[PDB]
Design a binder for this molecule. Structure first.
Ligand SMILES: COc1ccc(-c2csc(NC(=O)[C@H]3CCCCN3S(=O)(=O)c3ccc(C)cc3)n2)cc1
Ligand SMILES: COc1ccc(-c2csc(NC(=O)[C@H]3CCCCN3S(=O)(=O)c3ccc(C)cc3)n2)cc1
Ligand SMILES: COc1ccc(-c2csc(NC(=O)[C@H]3CCCCN3S(=O)(=O)c3ccc(C)cc3)n2)cc1
Ligand SMILES: COc1ccc(-c2csc(NC(=O)[C@H]3CCCCN3S(=O)(=O)c3ccc(C)cc3)n2)cc1
Ligand SMILES: [K+]
Ligand SMILES: [K+]
Ligand SMILES: [K+]
Ligand SMILES: [K+]
Lengths: 144, 330, 330, 330, 330, 144, 144, 144
């Protein structure tokens, strides 16, 4: 862990375009707009209204080190993510086919690149049937 | 041509405050034009009114004509109605055809009538028939019809029973009061029809007082009746009210889950990204896209969780029943 | 003789659209014959009416006579009523005996009366008494009676209380208004009976207006009364409505499970078969019977599962309580 | 002296059919004596009535006197009232003191009055005041009072609001109609009191018609009022009805468990016996006592189990929550 | 200056019996002053009344002036209003400004008017406007407004529908009855306004009787209408009643948990103490403080447990769902 | 078991006062009345309306051997009997004292002889406290 | 498994009376009518509206190999079938007697041949008592 | 245990200021008022309306030895006390910070000395984060 706690702080202030310990919330909207995102101001604000536990707007990784310090793979995030499929559960069994799954991954919320969605289920449709078992995908993402 | 659906749902699926006051304003216009149709039938004021109802009428007819044509054009955003055949499938619907005949018949009357009895005799019914134009989609009537169809049996029942009570008690009254003569010298109950009018007026708690019985028999029966039958003409109120309420709740519930879905989708749609942070200063662009992926994910997780909470009791029990099941596997 | 029960349930346990419009049509016939009994009591029209009510009456009496005899014959499908003794056990029931006396007394009146006052004086009551003929089985009245018996206590209570309020407040009013004389010179409250009529008419929200108090005392009391007692003659409505609704729901629920059973039976009745595919081109007949057994089984499984779903909350909790129990074994 | 409590609960805690028709009969007697008090105020019939109401009165007074004394004597079965001091604690209660003053004042009037105006003027109120005598224990009134106290806030609320609406709208009406003169030449709204009478009669849906406004202002206000305020004088009905129903259910529920207990007790009271079959042809007496112990036990087990079933949902969940807990131990 | 908030909540957040009868008494004073404003409009009594309403008025104005000033001073206990700016933020609120203008305008009228028509013409409206002064905080109106806003859709719906029914049926009636002439020689339905008055009076079950139709068409329509539309002006009652009740329950529930918290806090606040019995005849002081710590703890434990019991069903299920979860960890 | 399946049949018809295979339902009311019971006829009838699975009134131990062939000690009768105390559960813990227990055993349903109730709890109040633990009594009756 | 994946396809098109890869839904009604079934058209249609996951009407065992590829013996079909008895559960215990069981097997839904029903419970009434334990029948059918 | 069952009885009557076996309920209000408590009479009465199972007002440790004879550390008092935090549970996790915890310990019910509250959480905020894990405090108090 000690091998990234340092090179991470450099990118930490990389948003402020300076050496201030400032996440640069008003300037992250330009950082991303230059990355190719161009979000709205409400989304920009909600990005940090909770990602940063401090509450200021520019922080010295009180949580910018905590967000990174959250494996995002433990059991606390394997059930919350498994319930989302259960929204799409019907007759259970992790039945989902590539058909409904592509229908959905490319229509709702934050859609993917057609090449992203096509090869995303590719690793989860190894058997080639129309049942993309969830346990097959989380095990793939369990290292998140 | 993004404006097409924009004005459409400004006109046909309204929500907010702007479109609101629009519909509201047009409603008030309609209502005052009516309240002048009112004061038209009063001879004191039947002159100025019928006058200004020749200008205001033209105002409204042209207003509506344009609003209609523009609505129709803006009905393409909805594919079902795109293309001439779809368009026709549009005006085929009730409220639209109503607006159509309103506007065209106003035009008729004002194309011939202007060169006055039949005119105004029709204009009044138009000013009345227009009020339909506000409920742009009919949720009102649909609510009603559903609630009824549900409770059809109760309603039929109480109707049948009240009907019979009416019939019988009225016949008996007729028999008991047909001779009697009012103190004003006249006779109230000459026929069964009159008795039956009495019954209607009575059992539903109006009581004008134009027909009242005099004999001890009639009063006896009317009392018993009045006590033991009025209730069958007053249930529908409670029924329908409860139905309305229940249904609205049922709906907004469903709406809760329809809200639930998008978040479930976005969560994963962001997870796969942040996770898949290796295969979409180029490297700094990469770092930043990764960071935002991560943040967004952290956002979704919370939003989903908050949008999966137990609206009600059935929800909790389903959830934890399901946990139990998961044990049934374990 | 499969037709026997066929026409029976076409007549006595109707369901669908054909038998529906049949019953509906006969109902409308009855209703117009009544509405001519109406216009019979009106001297303007008491001539043509009483005439056509001599042909239409015969039409209906013969119609019903045949419908009755055929119904009776077709009452064998039900074993309880098969055989002369059962048949008699049939006509023993209320609605049947009603139809009987209707038809036979029409025949009486038209066998003697045709050779006119007493005649029509009875015919009206028959045309009225017939409406019972539509509700062929009485679910209406049974619903009612049940709901009452359930809520008997509430109803008695409010009745007793309203009765007393009536009594007392009316006596006091009588005391306060017995001298007073209407501006038309007459006296409304001469006795306690009149006051009591007032009370009835008042507390139940009719208010004809034939009896109104003049004195400050009477108005005072009538106000307080009118406010604090009317409610005890308007509860029954809400009560009965809720009862009706609840009961209908309760029933259709039960119906859900009565649907549930057959599938449970068929599932296994097909499982044992497909499983038992060895002991019922003969071998190809065997192969095909096996295949269809299998398919059917696959069908049942799904149909059962879909017909075992949680109508409501109690169902889920029973199910998973039971799973918990199953653990209690484990 | 087992009869003591026997007749007591025959009189004071009645249940069944005998005591029922007893109370019912005495009720009908009371009611006809009243309905002769009715026909007493009618000069056509004020002679024979006031006569027979001198014999029937004595009948009833002696009847009640004895029923009372015997009840009082039979109030010993209940220890609380045994002994002179308890006895006095008995007649201290409302319904008893009511019966007392009824009977003694009838005796008074008939001890002096017989040797006629004041007499009958009081007798009527007694015949009226007696009806209390039927509800022997007051469950009626207690139901009422409880339901109210529960819902006190809602009721006060709607009362306050309706009161205000009344006040204001009536003042405005007075202002708008005080000059106006009826077509019959007179004036309906001279004061605010009259307007306020109007309001009462109106907002509660009686509408006698003795006071109606003429001016466009008055009609306007009365319309708005009539639409938007009547509802606050009609809620109490629905409220109270729901309350009644709920409470009755709540009670009979509780009764279910009060039934539950005895069986729980008897089960074990029989188990210990059959089990303890060794320490209470003597040996054959022993064998038979053992056999009956066993049988009874087998009976209880089933009766308990059947009397522990889930009246409702809360019951099941408590039970299986508790099973879960039992696991929490395991 | 502890008295400050003391008298405050004696005046503004009243609870108990003392402050209760205070508010009650002042209410009765107001009400009688009104009922003299009543008897003021009656010429028989317009002299003595308008007199004593010159003394009683001054009494009340000074009474209220002081009660107001003292309330205002005692509004410091609440920090939000401390300091002149806060104080101003106080009188900014509705009920306070109402009391203010009442009192000052009474002072005005009695500063100029005493040296009589306009005076009393205003005084009546003040005596009326004052009743607001009792509901010191507005829970009444807030209850109402909430219940409405919730059920806004149902209400709008039934309003729209009843409105239309009114309109149409009234137009038709006008057409059918405009010629007809009452037996008293006059004409009831000259215009659509009159018909519309009829409709209002009818559909809401008042039935004055000043306007009644004569023709078979009018009676036909009025009957159908009277049966099938009155119910849309009587739903609001059931709705609002149910809403009120529900909301009160919801609230007192919440109150249960707000009670729950303090005990949860005190338990531990005592546990840490008794446990931490070593680091706050000195040693005997220590022993006794330890003993009382222990006792108190033993007290809390029980009080908490009793104040954590299942108010309702949702509570139990949450609890044991949570136990299940705890297993989900295990 | 085979040592009682025979001497039991002799007492089986001992109710009929004869050798008929008849439980003698109408005569059991006299058998017990002579034992010193003297029950009512409804209780006499309900005694067999379920104890005898046959349904006749006099039986050749279709169930008169089954009722005896029911140990009345297994787990199927240890919870149904434990719930009865739970009726008298309040604050749980098998808290019941000899006080409430004597209050109840001698007041409800089928009461005991004062000597029966006094020495019944005696074996269950070994510790002498006011908490007659149920687990202490069922273990005593587990051999029922 | 590979020993039946071939001789099964031959019977697969045996319904079409030809070599087309067609289940012959319209012709299965004649296949069975010749077998001695003679069903209705709605039942004929529902037979395949779900048995054939494809949705056409004539299929190349997309599911005609899946329906056969469903052991019909695993735990996923041992509880759904056990619940049906629980419909006939009353006082539990798998109490069912040959009496009620014959009453029912021959009266509801798709009844058996009297010889089918008589010898069906025969294997499940080995003890000869009136309690046909379900666990005794599923174990018999667990090989389904 | 036998080493305190004796020196405890001496303090037992130390409330009566005499040798009577009397808890001295009316005099405990002065004992504490001298200790520095000065409670009200209703609190004084409720202190013993349940602490003393006898019900008199002065007792010979029927429960004054039972209250001491209650370890106040077993599992029967580890969940009742853990639920109180669950009142302050929100998003779970024993998240409570020293911030809300100090906010509360010093505002509700029976507040502490600022030095009591400051050093009370001190032992429970060893990691110095804003999450005073409950399992960290009960283990500290498990010896209560
Ligand atoms: C104030 O306390 C009350 C007041 C009313 C009730 C109550 C329950 S059920 C009921 N009426 C009824 O159940 C029906 C049926 C029985 C007679 C009274 N009505 S009928 O006149 O419509 C009527 C009359 C004649 C015919 C041929 C058909 C229908 N009335 C209970 C308590
Ligand atoms: C608009 O806001 C309202 C309106 C009404 C209520 C409400 C609750 S309970 C109730 N009446 C009652 O509880 C009964 C009993 C008390 C007097 C008033 N009524 S009595 O006249 O029938 C009546 C009168 C005299 C006698 C001898 C018996 C029965 N009235 C509450 C709020
Ligand atoms: C047919 O569809 C309808 C009918 C009615 C409603 C409905 C909801 S709330 C309501 N009235 C009310 O909320 C009250 C308060 C607002 C004015 C109308 N009423 S007031 O006259 O008593 C009244 C008038 C004046 C004063 C000083 C106090 C009280 N009326 C909703 C839908
Ligand atoms: C005694 O048993 C009954 C009594 C009544 C019912 C019942 C259910 S729904 C219902 N009315 C209604 O649904 C509405 C709408 C259909 C016609 C009758 N009313 S309208 O007059 O307001 C009315 C009239 C004309 C216009 C243009 C609008 C609105 N009436 C059911 C059972
Ligand atoms: K009315
Ligand atoms: K009237
Ligand atoms: K009226
Ligand atoms: K009315």
């Amino acid at each position: 862990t000690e091998e990234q706690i340092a090179e991470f702080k450099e990118a930490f202030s990389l948003f402020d375009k300076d050496g201030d310990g400032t996440i640069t919330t008003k300037e992250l909207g330009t950082v991303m707009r230059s990355l190719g995102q161009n979000p709205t101001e409400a989304e920009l604000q909600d990005m940090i209204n909770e990602v940063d536990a401090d509450g200021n707007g520019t922080i010295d990784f009180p949580e910018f080190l905590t967000m990174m310090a959250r494996k995002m793979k433990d059991t606390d995030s394997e059930e919350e993510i498994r319930e989302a499929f259960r929204v799409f559960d019907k007759d259970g069994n992790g039945y989902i086919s590539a058909a409904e799954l592509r229908h959905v991954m490319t229509n709702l919320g934050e859609k993917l690149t057609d090449e992203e969605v096509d090869e995303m289920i590719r690793e989860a449709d190894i058997d080639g049937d129309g049942q993309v078992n969830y346990e097959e995908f989380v095990q793939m993402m369990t290292a998140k | 041509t993004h404006v097409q659906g924009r004005v459409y749902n400004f006109l046909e699926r309204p929500t907010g405050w702007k479109c609101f006051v629009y519909h509201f304003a047009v409603f008030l216009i309609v209502l005052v034009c009516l309240i002048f149709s009112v004061l038209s039938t009063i001879e004191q004021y039947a002159a100025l009114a019928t006058g200004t109802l020749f200008w205001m009428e033209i105002v409204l007819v042209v207003f509506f004509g344009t609003e209609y044509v523009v609505r129709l054009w803006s009905a393409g955003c909805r594919s079902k109605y795109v293309g001439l055949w779809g368009r026709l499938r549009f005006a085929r619907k009730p409220i639209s055809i109503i607006d159509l005949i309103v506007v065209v018949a106003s035009m008729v009357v004002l194309c011939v009538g202007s060169k006055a009895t039949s005119a105004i005799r029709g204009i009044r019914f138009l000013q009345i028939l227009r009020m339909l134009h506000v409920d742009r989609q009919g949720g009102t009537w649909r609510l009603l019809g559903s609630v009824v169809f549900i409770h059809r049996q109760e309603l039929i029942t109480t109707l049948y029973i009240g009907f019979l009570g009416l019939i019988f008690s009225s016949y008996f009254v007729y028999l008991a009061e047909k001779d009697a003569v009012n103190e004003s010298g006249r006779v109230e109950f000459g026929s069964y029809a009159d008795a039956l009018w009495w019954g209607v007026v009575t059992v539903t708690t109006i009581g004008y007082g134009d027909k009242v019985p005099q004999t001890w028999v009639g009063k006896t029966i009317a009392s018993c009746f009045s006590v033991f039958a009025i209730s069958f003409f007053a249930l529908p109120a409670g029924i329908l009210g409860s139905g309305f309420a229940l249904k609205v709740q049922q709906k907004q519930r469903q709406k809760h889950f329809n809200r639930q879905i998008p978040a479930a989708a976005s969560l994963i749609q962001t997870a796969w990204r942040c996770y898949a942070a290796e295969n979409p200063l180029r490297e700094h662009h990469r770092a930043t896209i990764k960071v935002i992926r991560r943040m967004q994910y952290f956002v979704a997780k919370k939003k989903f969780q908050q949008a999966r909470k137990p609206y009600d009791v059935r929800d909790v029990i389903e959830q934890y029943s399901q946990g139990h099941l998961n044990l049934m596997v374990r």
